[PDB]
């Protein structure tokens, strides 16, 4: 699923980049003033041994 979702995401970005025009691209200071800075994902996995993570086989033995 993820692969397919990403592939189509990659494909249309490969097209968007094609349309990029350095000659017309204008820069504004409102990005530094009115628009938040890019933030990469900061997900950290924890509590890996909750009962809900217990595999079915062991659950039955339990």
């Amino acid at each position: 699923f993820r692969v397919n979702s990403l592939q189509e995401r990659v494909d249309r970005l490969s097209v968007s980049v094609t349309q990029l025009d350095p000659k017309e691209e204008e820069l504004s200071l409102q990005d530094i003033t009115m628009r938040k800075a890019f933030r990469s994902s900061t997900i950290q996995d924890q509590q890996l041994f909750d009962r809900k993570t217990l595999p079915i086989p062991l659950q039955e033995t339990y």
Binding site: L29, I32, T33, Q44, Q46, Q47
Partner: protein, 36 residues
Amino acid sequence: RSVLLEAIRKGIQLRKVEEIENDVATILSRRIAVEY
């Protein structure tokens, strides 16, 4: 003097003011944030 400066003055007034407690990592981070 410049429009860029104001654009910076506001940037500082946003990363300063606009700046899970039962978490194992969190609890450990604070126990260390005191020794320093």
